[PDB]
Amino acid sequence: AFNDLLQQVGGVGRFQQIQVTLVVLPLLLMASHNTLQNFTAAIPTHHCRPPWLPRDRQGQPESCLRFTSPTEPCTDGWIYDNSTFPSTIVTEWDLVCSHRALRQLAQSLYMVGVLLGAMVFGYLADRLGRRKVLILNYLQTAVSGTCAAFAPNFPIYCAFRLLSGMALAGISLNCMTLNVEWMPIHTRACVGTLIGYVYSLGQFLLAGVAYAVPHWRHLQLLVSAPFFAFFIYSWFFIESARWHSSSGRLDLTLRALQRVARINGKREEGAKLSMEVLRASLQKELLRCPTLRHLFLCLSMLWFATSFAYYGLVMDLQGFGVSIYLIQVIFGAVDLPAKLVGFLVINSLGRRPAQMAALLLAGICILLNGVIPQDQSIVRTSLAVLGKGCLAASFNCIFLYTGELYPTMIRQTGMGMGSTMARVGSIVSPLVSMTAELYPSMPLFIYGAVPVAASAVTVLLPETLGQ
Ligand SMILES: CCCc1nc(C(C)(C)O)c(C(=O)O)n1Cc1ccc(-c2ccccc2-c2nnn[nH]2)cc1
Ligand SMILES: [Br-]
């Protein structure tokens, strides 16, 4: 068995600690990139440009309509507010009113890239390697991200944000994958938990960076800046030894394991390992099968709906009556208690009842936001914060539940394609937000009605607690 031989060089050790820390380090910036459209594309208060401006029923000047003489649409441009948002992509290329969907199109195009990033670079890691793909993904995001910060017009920004989406998907996919191939079976849950916790710490980093750097060009450049430094040390990564065995390169596998032995200091055991011993140790459809088919759609709907309403709330921080810098801190802050409640309930009640309670409660909070009047800022903000926490507690549960609900043969493929359909939800969520022109609370109603119907799916699943 490979697990027993991985413990020969000491199991978890100095090499394992050093590389896992460096591989998980860019995961802090993963949350910032996924949410960066909130700060780089924030919509400030604006009004038409006189060469004058009607006021709405609320009292503020009516946007994109001006009097012909002291009604006609804006022709000379728009005047924005520099008090809170000095420069965003909305102010730069006039993505207001008529071109309101263009701002959402940036996230949809970016989320198209992250979907194709898992599909393409997932296939590349099987043929090329896990270390080789990581090197080509730390560079790509740094080049694509920086080139996006200097985009001359809008189409160039969308094309260079899509490329950053493809590379970031490869980073996330090859972070957990490369980490588990170099770590023993015993320390497999610690890595899985650490990936999610490091992922949830990125919201705090985004708020701190965006507060000091409000400009969209400087914030985007600074966010993609470390990925050049990550590429500098990404060369010093040891390729997964198990993958080398699967590729018929046992000579490379022996060298990789020997190199680990000297790093951990147990070089005596590494010298014992040899090709004869290495070979002796390592001697060992989803919808096509109705049995797994009726298990796939139920899991797929949970992955889609949980992600569909997640990015329908994280992307819409503005409008709760609180500064977005404070809300981003609070949204990140509610993540840790939400897992604690979920993890305790999961082990005390069951994966299925907890998931249904987490999804149903999350759907109610989102749905009640549209009904509640916008005047009550504190209550409306609190319900959204509670809804965000319950959605996060659903992600942790569905990640655990999916693994236990799949046979060992198809578990790895099911989890990968199960997360793939989750990336599909993050694509449609910005698209649904584009219907806010038809009705103002319609996007919030839809984001709160899909998880409610998704909670009925979990009932059809079989409970796996204590089984
Ligand atoms: C908090 C964001 C949730 C999310 N975003 C994405 C995008 C950016 C579209 O890729 C996906 C996806 O890859 O499908 N997901 C799903 C996800 C589920 C569980 C977890 C998780 C939860 C707890 C502990 C660990 C993890 C985990 N496993 N692998 N990576 N993180 C992380 C992400
Ligand atoms: Br991800």
UniProtKB/Swiss-Prot annotation:
Glycan attachment residues as annotated in the record: N38, N82
Important for interaction with cidofovir (site feature) positions: Y199
Highest classification ranks of the organism: Eukaryota, Metazoa, Chordata, Craniata, Vertebrata
One annotated GO molecular function: xenobiotic transmembrane transporter activity
Catalytic activity entry: (6R)-L-erythro-5,6,7,8-tetrahydrobiopterin(out) + a dicarboxylate(in) = (6R)-L-erythro-5,6,7,8-tetrahydrobiopterin(in) + a dicarboxylate(out); L-erythro-7,8-dihydrobiopterin(out) + a dicarboxylate(in) = L-erythro-7,8-dihydrobiopterin(in) + a dicarboxylate(out); L-sepiapterin(out) + a dicarboxylate(in) = L-sepiapterin(in) + a dicarboxylate(out); prostaglandin F2alpha(out) + a dicarboxylate(in) = prostaglandin F2alpha(in) + a dicarboxylate(out)
Intervals, Cytoplasmic compartment: 1-8, 126-133, 183-193, 239-294, 347-352, 404-412
Entry comment describing in which tissues the protein is expressed: Strongly expressed in kidney. Expressed at lower level in liver, skeletal muscle, brain and placenta. In kidney, found at the basolateral membrane of the proximal tubule. In testis, primarily localized to the basal membrane of Sertoli cells and weakly expressed in Leydig cells and vascular endothelial cells.
Keywords noted in UniProt: Cell membrane, Glycoprotein, Membrane, Transmembrane, Transmembrane helix
One of the GO biological process terms: sodium-independent organic anion transport
The protein, known as: Solute carrier family 22 member 6
